Symmetry: C2
Subunit: 149 residues, 2 copies
């Protein structure tokens, strides 16, 4: 089972509930090339929940993508899990690193659909610092899409 790889890189540890409960939102991505972010160009917003993957060391995201054009695309994604920022800039936040052969991207989620702008700024600033200058912030102009139970 070859899946894309997630590594938790840091989070706001004071947020509730634990990560496998409740909803998360997709805020922004940073990568070294535009290709590693292009998949998100049609996205307005993403609401999702994270679950343990039944098989070991696995994460499942159940998502509904709100599209810039206004429609909703439901999605169930399975990943392999790997074997400052959130202290003030990003309350309710989590940053993950997505990895497979030939690609890397950093992904910024939040418990809130509209976190304080200084979160995206600090994430941009930090990733830009280390030369991951391809950057994408979801516009989040539209309502979230329905997501099951």
């Amino acid at each position: 089972p070859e899946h894309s790889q997630l590594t938790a890189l840091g989070m706001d540890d004071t947020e509730t509930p634990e990560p496998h409960l409740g909803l998360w939102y997709f805020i922004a991505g940073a990568a070294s090339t535009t290709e590693e972010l292009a998949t998100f160009d049609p996205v307005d917003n993403i609401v999702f929940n994270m679950a343990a993957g039944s098989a070991p060391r696995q994460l499942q995201l159940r998502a509904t993508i709100r599209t810039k054009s206004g429609v909703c695309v439901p999605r169930k994604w399975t990943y392999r899990l790997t074997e400052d920022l959130f202290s003030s800039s990003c309350p309710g936040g989590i940053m993950l690193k997505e990895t497979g052969q030939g690609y890397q991207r950093f992904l910024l989620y939040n418990r809130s659909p509209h976190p304080p702008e200084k979160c995206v700024e600090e994430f941009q600033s930090l990733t830009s610092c280390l030369d991951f200058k391809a950057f994408l912030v979801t516009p989040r102009n539209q309502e979230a899409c329905p997501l099951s139970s």
Copy 2:
């Protein structure tokens, strides 16, 4: 001419003189694997100057490495140049990214042989954040070595 690649990633812009004049010191390195830093294990300190490389888009470092065992190894290195941190944490600092096929490392220099410890801490913290957890700080217990003119 295939050389290792340097990209200036940020610097304290208030330091004098311009980078191609005066001396610099090697403070620390961060990479994703120990292999990308192993070359520096025998190092106590490095004093060097940076020069334009006569051929275009090229940088030359003339260095003398003080070795942990106490000796001095002179060095002339030629690189290809690419086509927050320093605002407070690292006065006199510069961070570079060294790159070639199959490897990346971030390199921290300073005008001063012993910058304030909160510089190394912020560089460690920032690189560690983005999952570049192989880390090396030169011990700098010994005197710098002589370097020409």
